[PDB]
Design a protein. Structure first.
Length: 169
């Protein structure tokens, strides 16, 4: 079955689907160095809970969804995530599998759900959040994977990079 490897070095391919479910006009977006460097690479994607330039506080419910997948005996997903700004790091997200369609309502099996945590002597810390790697088992018959930024507000960005799916298959 499917191997998928996406480094986001040239944005979000049209074969991926984005859903701005909350309807504010802000969804998952391409990021690149120097503003928004990827993991060991130039490009990534990001989603905002606060926008620069007067945009202000947001309440995202934003989906980034893979192309269709062929996983008759399941597979393994890995990806990298961080908080863009270590002082505003508490972004919440979940990863879902659908066996059916690729609408928001088809993503109900949360495989992974978490709020990012920032990593007594006074010491200078990183400006940007540390990249962490996540590994998720994908059930047999999974056709789409969704990354959902939601139940988040008034932090900064969540960044996502280097998505790999290996079929068992
Ligand atoms: Ca990248
Ligand atoms: Ca939105």
């Amino acid at each position: 079955g499917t191997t998928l490897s996406e480094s986001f070095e040239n944005g979000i391919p049209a074969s991926w689907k984005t859903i701005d479910a909350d309807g504010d006009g802000h969804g998952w977006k391409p990021g690149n160095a120097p503003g928004i460097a990827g993991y060991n690479s130039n490009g990534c994607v990001y989603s905002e809970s606060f926008g620069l330039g007067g945009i202000g506080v947001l309440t995202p419910d934003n989906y980034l969804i893979t192309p269709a997948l062929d996983l008759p005996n399941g597979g393994k997903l890995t990806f990298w995530v961080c908080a863009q700004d270590a002082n505003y790091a508490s972004e919440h997200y979940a990863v879902y599998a659908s066996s059916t369609g690729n609408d928001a309502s088809n993503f109900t099996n949360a495989l992974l759900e978490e709020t990012i945590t920032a990593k007594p002597k006074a010491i200078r810390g990183r400006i940007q959040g540390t990249w962490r790697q996540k590994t998720v088992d994908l059930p047999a018959g999974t056709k789409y994977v969704a990354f959902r930024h939601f139940q988040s507000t008034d932090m900064f960005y969540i960044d996502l990079d280097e998505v790999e799916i290996k079929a068992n298959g």
